Ligand binder design. Structure first.
Ligand SMILES: CCCc1cscc1C[C@H](NC1=NC(C)(C)Cc2cc(Cl)ccc21)C(=O)O
Ligand SMILES: [Zn+2]
Ligand SMILES: [Zn+2]
Ligand SMILES: [Zn+2]
Length: 387
């Protein structure tokens, strides 16, 4: 897949984007790759932080679906008008498809200064598409209309590659290990064990996946459920206790610095997440270096210093394995086989003495179902799904 290597740009803090062309003649736009959502949505009116956007009036192949859509986040919102147009990925597969496109007409705190993407590509499943699961996501349209294989892989480099329809063995080293997709909505997986510098957190493993665990290229941080977040911070604090940081650091709200080149990497522990194997009673681990969760941020005054933000944060909506965790790894989203693969990426994050790793198997004489069952609402229970 030589044509698809290096088809991503961006960083964990602002997102990774791929070029896509919409309409005819083709309008080229840079589009955020988001495995945490399922809508293809592009800015479609002027915005102070955009200079280009999708002009529906310039596309001869645009069709209005005459239905609006409103997508609120905790942190902002986008809204728009649904339609369809021709869509290609110029540094992707040699195919063109008719896809749904939400033309974003208004938004709040969605587009950010200097991100360089004008739209989001929701790669997750129809169950979570807005307004409902009848709006076919982009990837489903791609596979249905072209028989490209039903899989894509992400190598995020903190630069990167989204390989559509296959696995490129140049982008990884060592074994690819697969964890099952628990349910096809988010890319949901199950964590069976957590260690921080070799020490087991020793929590009921359902706590790890409360109320889900997901792989999300649209989220910067590793996000952890409250109880797990507190046990991890306690453990990382213990390891690094030669350094007393302000509370705002552990909250992600403040940088901590050392003199250029002197950052004591060794006092920050590795985190291993053991993911359910394809074989019952097997798991494998992904091992995250401190350089993945302590992220450099160059502030104006501190030119003499390397300064860092803590990129693990508390969640009330489950574990999120966001971009800073994926950056170590070649991640295969094998929708055909309902599984996600992890291998050590060819773009390595390095540490003096330790390596981000993917290792297995680890066998357990049980476990234990570590999956959590989200309490079924009457709203969910009642919608009919006639497919
Ligand atoms: C790696 C992408 C990071 C990135 C680009 S813009 C903001 C971020 C940080 C991200 N939040 C968001 N992600 C996307 C996928 C764009 C969805 C969304 C919508 C709104 Cl209305 C506000 C923030 C975010 C996070 O919470 O971590
Ligand atoms: Zn190009
Ligand atoms: Zn019905
Ligand atoms: Zn349905």
């Amino acid at each position: 897949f030589v044509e698809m290597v290096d088809n991503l740009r961006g960083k964990s803090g602002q997102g990774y984007y791929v070029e896509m062309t919409v309409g005819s003649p083709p309008q080229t736009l840079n589009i955020l790759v988001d495995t945490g959502s399922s809508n293809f949505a592009v800015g479609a009116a002027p915005h102070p932080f955009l200079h280009r956007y999708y002009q529906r009036q310039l596309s001869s192949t645009y069709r209005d679906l005459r239905k609006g859509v409103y997508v609120p986040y905790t942190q902002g919102k986008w809204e728009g008008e649904l339609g369809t147009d021709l869509v290609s990925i110029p540094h992707g597969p040699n195919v063109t498809v008719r896809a749904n496109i939400a033309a974003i007409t208004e938004s709040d705190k969605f587009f950010i200064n200097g991100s360089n993407w004008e739209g989001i590509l929701g790669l997750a499943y129809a169950e979570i598409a807005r307004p409902d699961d009848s709006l076919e996501p982009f990837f489903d349209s791609l596979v249905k209309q072209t028989h490209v294989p039903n899989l894509f892989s992400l190598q995020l480099c903190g630069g990167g590659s989204m390989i559509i329809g296959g696995i490129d063995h140049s982008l990884y080293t060592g074994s690819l290990w697969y964890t099952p997709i628990r349910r096809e909505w988010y890319y949901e997986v199950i964590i069976v064990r957590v260690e921080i510098n070799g020490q087991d957190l020793k929590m009921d493993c359902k706590e790890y996946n409360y109320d889900k665990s997901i792989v999300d290229s649209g989220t910067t941080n590793l996000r952890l459920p409250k109880k797990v977040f507190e046990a991890a911070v306690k453990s990382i604090k213990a390891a690094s206790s030669t350094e007393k940081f302000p509370d705002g650091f552990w909250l992600g709200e403040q940088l901590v610095c050392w003199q250029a080149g002197t950052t004591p990497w060794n006092i920050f522990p590795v985190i291993s997440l053991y993911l359910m194997g394809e074989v019952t009673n097997q798991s494998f681990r992904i091992t995250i270096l401190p350089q993945q969760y302590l992220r450099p941020v160059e502030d104006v005054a501190t030119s003499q210093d390397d300064c860092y933000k803590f990129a693990i944060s508390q969640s009330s909506t489950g574990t999120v394995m966001g971009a800073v965790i994926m950056e170590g790894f070649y991640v295969v989203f094998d929708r055909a086989r309902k599984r996600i693969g992890f291998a050590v990426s060819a773009c390595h994050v390095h540490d003096e003495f330790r390596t981000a790793a993917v290792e297995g198997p680890f066998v357990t004489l049980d476990m234990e179902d570590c999956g959590y069952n989200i309490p079924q609402t009457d709203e969910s229970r009642s919608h009919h799904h006639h497919h």
